[PDB]
Design a protein around this ligand. Structure first.
Ligand code: HEM
Ligand code: HEM
Ligand code: HEM
Lengths: 679, 681, 249, 83, 83
């Protein structure tokens, strides 16, 4: 068990009388008053100690990635990688290292919607026997900016307007689009955010990326450039913006519940840890600088090499103490790994340590159960707000005769200490400039777009069309279209149409037809299901419930959790029609003999809002979800204009519906149900 | 037999035999910064430097708003019997019941780095780690407080503390603002008389009597209450310094009391205190000539004898001053079943204040989760979240009432779950008002009862303190206002102070004048029940074989329980302190060894090792400060060089049989008051 | 009150004549809450010190040596504020303690705030900033008992000097008159570090900052200094205050 | 409500913030505290006082248009933890 | 840098630039301060370091401590004076 180290700090209050924070049994339900109908007394210590705790419960949210969720896990190494890295969690076969991952959005505040369109976070803590190792990544391999100094500018621009604080968890506003049109480096991550990567189905159906180039140092000192990758065993799956908008309102904790449910149900999510190895001498050899966070390395130039697997088997016991309080830092490095001269990475090392003081009100944030390592801490650090420990060592300085030299210095040769790569050199003038090798901002965005399916590319343009239509400034819209035209003239002309402006001037400078693998979401098929969310639209009258229960049993057999929807909570009913919605499910199936409730008199029930069952079916189909009807249920599809056999849509008997709807999920989303330009 | 710090073991960190690590683990080298070349600039990518310096830059927490300067010790409280008849308290619930304690002694006006031997009210705060919650008796070494209403606390503190413009003076009340407040708030006159006496400048934290000040209630299981006054009587006896000594000590060793306690525990001689109480019937609250809800008045021993309940001994020193002493957060609101509050307006406002202040000092609400604050009773409540939450709570239904949590944590009261309850008889009657009772109007009778209960010489020390302090007031009108208030207590006190100020004090006001005397208020009347942990300085020399004779005196003295330090020109075979390092303030008894008279006269006094005329000064200082002085054999010439008689009271001359037993006798007296000039000669 | 409105903050609101204080007494709470939260943490080093406002006047146009604004003009008046201090001493420590003294100067230039955070000794104990916690932890009071206050006369401090020989120069300065000066006014100040003075064109010159006292350097004797720490712990604090008030700035 | 501000604002001078500050004017002996925005002119920050000539002065029902609790308001009965 | 390796030349330049009585004050501060060290090995370690600056400084301090460790190390010894 990964949570074993937290068992000593775990409190049970069952079978116990109410006490104050300083001990002693009490009754915290009545205030001390001066008489029967009298004023409350200052001498009521019980009231004050209870309310003081409550009044001071909240800590500041993270400056970015405020909205998110975590889970505990176990990382297992596939073999001894001592040849490539001196890391401890990697230099052994089948070595089990405890982990904790916190996935998140960006612009969104603490209460923002899980299904908002943003870059997603993928922060992973490795509780190594040689210290805490963090890979604070994102679901997109590229970042918006090239210099960390520009981070406040990017965040201030994407986040709500400073005058009214509108909008929440969105980039559809003047300020955000002014920055992208003024900082062309931001164009690659935009294309990724405008794609399926911006609105994924779940945290489990996400690929993770360390973004930066790092170094892997061997015992001897030989280094190799490295790129961290987290490949999902569940496969990449994404929603559609029209679905995503409804889900943000119907269930703002969509991803948060998706993860929680998976772990509890037994189907724990997995990720393979892959790397891209690059020689120090081939840092600019691939047509771009590897110190550039706006560019990613294609799989064709460097194949991915799997090092191990990380699975999340335990959910937290207290969201605050664990998920909210966890303080990640990319500066949480161990012997075997080292930084690169990536200007974005360089500034992050400072920022993450600094911010911790605001969020936690002191320096002992690493003493918190969720942050503390398993390796042990022996240093000269003393005092500070909320000191949890009592240091036996009175000679808290170095060098020293009195402490016989303890704690001792460790480096490369002795005590397995951390060391910077010996080959690393500083050369040239001290300056506040950026390398000329960082000047290309249009080639890489087009490589991604050219590597997506025709309907996927539309989704990218249908996100930009949506977002840009919110810009009130006419000049910002033109500035955006000028930048988009530099990537692709096709992309620019398609967006231009929705905006009412006409500015097509093909600039063939960065135009190319090159395609890269592993960037598409829907192109590959779903491996296991294991997804799942199947909604069964049934009714309380006509014995449809009994037929729906039979479908529920047979479908769950392949490792699923099917929810039966009816007018009220009968014998086999899990959700009602007023509580249920199409956003909650991936597959919508209408049970046999489900009325007359789709268009007849049965549609007008005081139990659910007018025309609800019909809406769940309508929504599913338009969102590309595989829809199904058993026997008589064909009239449900006909009431809106849906043909018997087309894409995912399958009719017939009981077993005839089960087989096919399962195949639909492998495709997940039916792209043929979406209008592409030129038709 | 047991370690009073056993519960803090879980949190102790040993770094012996371990390599240097970061706060997040991993072995490191924190002695060199990462640079861009040989003679290059430091890199931001040096996580080692930043994580080391960040911790250091954030080491300091705010000091206590009052009682900033002080030191604590761990201890064990033992009950003398079963007091269930008088109180429902658990720690007083059985005979020989051992309850872990932690006491912090302090000053008031002094800041974190202020001198221990300054003229202030001293703090004496005890934590009882009961098997029924943490119980605090946040008291002082004086039974009376300056003000009657807690709302006036900022006014009193702002007045006594350094001036807001320049922040002068530190740990002193000798300034316009402090003396304007006393002359404007006559309630402050009783504690002033106590602060101006020996109680203001005590010898050590161990030679102090402690008082809970407020009147409290002791509730039985049935609900019957009794008014109570907490007292801490020292088994070591009350001993105080002299202002002239106290001033030199503040400079020579500002950690005088801090070391005094530390040394006692390490040497084995642990300090003890008996826990005494004054029991009073609810109906006899105004029966004693004053209101018992008044913190400016104390109850005389003649009306209510002290009854001993148990004994508290401090056997363990802390391992980390910060984590333990600095971080301890006392509260008089830390109450348990068996004890209850009174309608004392000073106590009432304290309950709020102490809980509030912790949010500043600790920057959050989980200050009670800190090892030093945590109870031994166990914590079960629906409190969640909050800055630096150290616990993972298992109950997801953090509310009451609740079906889901089966009713846990359950409510406890008087009848169920041994919970706390307010005294049933306690009633509220009358109009809601912002006034004070007429029974609080007497501010001059009680100051005069204390003064009349001191020895003639002690009375002079009170007079002289006021003479010293008032001479610092720059405002002529403030000095007159002070003398007008002093004249209301005693016409003798007022005329004696007036002399030093240059201005006469009219006119005898016989309203609150009386000749009544109370017992147990004098520091210098009763002799010390023990002579252990009493420092004795042996003035010897490296020439003439005096060292060998001094070592013999040191041996016979150390076996009695005393701590002996041999002073010479340099650190020879049996030398502990040199002449440049040593001073009379450090010792209680000053003895000149045979053959050491050589460094008093001639060239022997002119040495490059110590400042000109140092040995003579140590002897001079000791005599003028009333410390018992001694000379062995020929060392009589040392006393003669300043004009000291060998047959005087306190002075000892003869052999290494006569001095050894003769000095230890004078220590029981501690301070010879006959050497101090009284007015009237 | 802090939120306006005339009040009487001398009596607590009680339930009767000799009654308990009420929670509804906003006056008491708002007054005591302010008091309870008056203290901020003291400086990690140089906690004990005192300051004064001043005026810096340039003797001429130094544009040839530096592009600085407060210097590139004749008789240019720049507002200043200096805070002199000790090191190991805490907030209430004695002014006359033996330590390195601080000499922090703020230049309120028309081109930003310029600080020369120096010391009365031209040399520092250590060579790498990473060793600063080690030096401070060693010189400051012992972590077990917090003894001694504002002093270097203890095992830990002398172990560091004997183990870090770089500390030997500043020790000799601290052991001299520079360690126990007569006043803040009778002190010489030093920027310690070597800095650079850049001209408009970009040409640099290495520079060492110095503050020479017009009052002259004067120091006490340790035997006097020990008695003064007890008799008047605000000796230097008053010395400065008195000088400005008396006219002799 | 008064208590919670210490968490949200991390100090006692939250009333000195432009949005919180009254238009009536502030005259009290409150000093120091995290982020003190004002330089107070009266060096005798206490009451009662001869030195400050009695300023800031106490105001009540009859004098200085000060706040007062309803005179008729009375407390009667046992002190209890009931409703 | 190797250019930072000299720690004894500069301390002697200061000491050589002080008046005879001033130099005493330096030694009379060290004698005072070192007499407080409880560890015998720390005192010897201090005197070993002081001996590397000046043998005169080391022998004068040694007297007050009761230890005798005079071994002149002429490596960083000089008679240069600064104003
Ligand atoms: C490749 C670029 C970046 C990635 C992948 C990234 C990713 C993340 C993630 C995933 C989190 C939240 C971690 C968690 O779940 O607790 C986070 C937080 C944060 N990031 Fe970034 N970040 C990037 C760049 C930056 C930069 C350039 C800065 C500023 C220099 C920055 C400053 C922060 C701060 C201050 C937080 C809040 C962290 C905390 O309160 O613990 N990030 N970042
Ligand atoms: C009989 C009257 C009083 C006594 C005996 C008393 C005693 C003490 C003592 C001994 C301490 C320091 C405790 C420690 O060693 O940590 C202390 C602290 C303090 N006292 Fe008082 N006090 C009294 C009245 C007041 C009043 C009336 C107030 C305000 C209403 C007050 C507010 C405080 C505060 C805020 C602290 C700082 C506590 C902390 O930071 O933990 N005290 N008091
Ligand atoms: C030549 C070396 C140094 C000099 C002259 C120096 C001088 C000073 C002075 C004069 C102050 C107090 C300024 C004031 O009056 O407010 C101060 C404060 C401080 N110093 Fe140093 N210092 C030196 C080196 C260091 C080093 C190496 C560090 C750590 C890397 C450091 C960290 C600090 C800190 C944290 C404070 C507290 C400042 C504050 O709270 O505002 N100092 N120093």
């Amino acid at each position: 068990d990964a949570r074993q180290r937290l068992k000593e700090v775990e409190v049970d209050d069952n079978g116990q009388f109410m006490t104050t924070d300083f001990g002693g049994n009490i009754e915290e339900q009545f205030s001390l008053k001066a008489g029967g109908r009298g004023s409350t007394l200052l001498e009521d210590f019980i009231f004050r100690q209870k309310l003081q705790h409550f009044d001071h419960e909240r800590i500041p949210e993270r400056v970015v990635h405020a909205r998110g969720a975590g889970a505990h896990g176990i990382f297992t190494s596939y073999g001894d990688w001592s040849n490539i890295t001196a890391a401890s969690f990697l230099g052994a076969k089948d070595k089990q290292t405890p982990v904790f991952v916190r996935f998140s959005t960006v612009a969104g505040s603490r209460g923002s919607a899980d299904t908002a369109r943003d870059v997603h976070g993928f922060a992973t803590r490795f509780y190594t026997d040689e210290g805490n190792f963090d890979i604070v990544g994102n679901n997109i391999p590229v970042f918006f900016i090239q210099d960390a100094i520009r981070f406040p500018d990017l965040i201030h621009s994407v986040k709500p307007s400073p005058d009214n604080e509108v909008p929440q968890a969105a980039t559809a506003h003047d300020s955000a689009w002014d920055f992208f049109s003024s900082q062309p480096s931001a164009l690659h991550t935009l294309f990724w955010a405008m794609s399926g990567n911006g609105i994924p189905r779940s945290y489990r159906h996400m690929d993770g990326f360390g973004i930066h180039t790092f170094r892997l140092v061997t015992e001897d000192g030989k280094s190799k450039l490295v790129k961290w990758h987290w490949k999902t065993k569940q496969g990449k799956a994404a929603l559609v913006w029209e679905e995503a908008q409804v889900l943000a309102g119907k269930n703002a904790d969509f991803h948060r519940q998706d993860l929680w449910d998976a772990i509890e149900s037994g189907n724990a999510p997995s990720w393979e840890l892959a790397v891209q190895l690059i020689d120090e001498d081939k840092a600019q050899a691939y047509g771009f600088d590897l110190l550039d966070p706006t560019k990613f390395l294609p799989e064709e130039f460097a194949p991915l090499q799997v090092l191990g697997e990380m699975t999340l088997n335990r959910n937290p016991m207290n969201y605050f103490a664990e998920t909210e309080q966890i303080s990640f830092q990319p500066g949480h490095i161990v012997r075997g790994v080292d930084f690169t001269e990536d200007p974005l990475l360089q500034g992050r090392l400072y920022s993450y340590l600094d911010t911790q003081l605001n969020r936690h009100r002191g320096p002992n944030f690493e003493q918190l159960p969720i942050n503390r390592p398993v390796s042990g801490v022996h240093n000269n650090h003393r005092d500070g707000q909320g000191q949890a420990w009592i240091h036996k060592n009175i000679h808290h300085y170095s060098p020293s005769y009195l402490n016989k030299g303890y704690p001792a210095q460790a480096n490369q040769t002795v005590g397995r200490g951390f060391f910077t790569t010996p080959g690393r050199t500083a050369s040239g003038v001290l300056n506040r400039e950026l390398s000329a090798t960082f000047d290309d901002h249009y080639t890489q965005p087009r490589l991604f777009f050219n590597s997506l399916t025709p309907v996927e590319q539309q989704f990218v343009i249908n996100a930009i069309r949506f977002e840009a239509s919110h810009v009130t400034n006419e000049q910002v819209k033109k500035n955006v279209l000028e930048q988009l035209n530099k990537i692709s003239n096709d992309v620019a002309k398609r967006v231009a149409v929705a905006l009412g402006l006409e500015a097509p001037q093909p600039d063939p400078t960065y135009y190319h037809n090159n395609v890269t693998r592993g960037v598409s979401i829907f192109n590959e098929s779903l491996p296991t299901i294991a997804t799942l969310r199947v909604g069964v639209l049934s009714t309380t009258k006509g014995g449809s419930l009994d037929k729906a229960k039979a479908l529920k049993e047979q479908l769950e057999k392949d490792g699923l959790k099917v929810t039966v929807i009816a007018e009220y909570l009968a014998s086999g009913v899990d959700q009602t029609y007023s509580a249920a919605d199409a956003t909650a499910f991936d597959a919508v199936v209408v049970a046999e003999g489900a009325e007359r409730v789709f268009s007849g008199k049965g549609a007008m029930s005081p139990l659910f809002p007018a025309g609800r069952p019909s809406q769940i079916l309508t929504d599913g189909y338009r969102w590309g979800k595989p829809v199904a009807a058993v026997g008589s249920a064909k009239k449900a599809l006909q009431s809106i204009g849906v043909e018997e056999k087309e894409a995912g849509v399958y009719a017939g008997a009981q077993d005839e519906v089960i087989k096919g709807v399962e195949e639909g999920l492998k495709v997940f989303k039916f792209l043929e149900r979406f209008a592409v330009d030129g038709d």
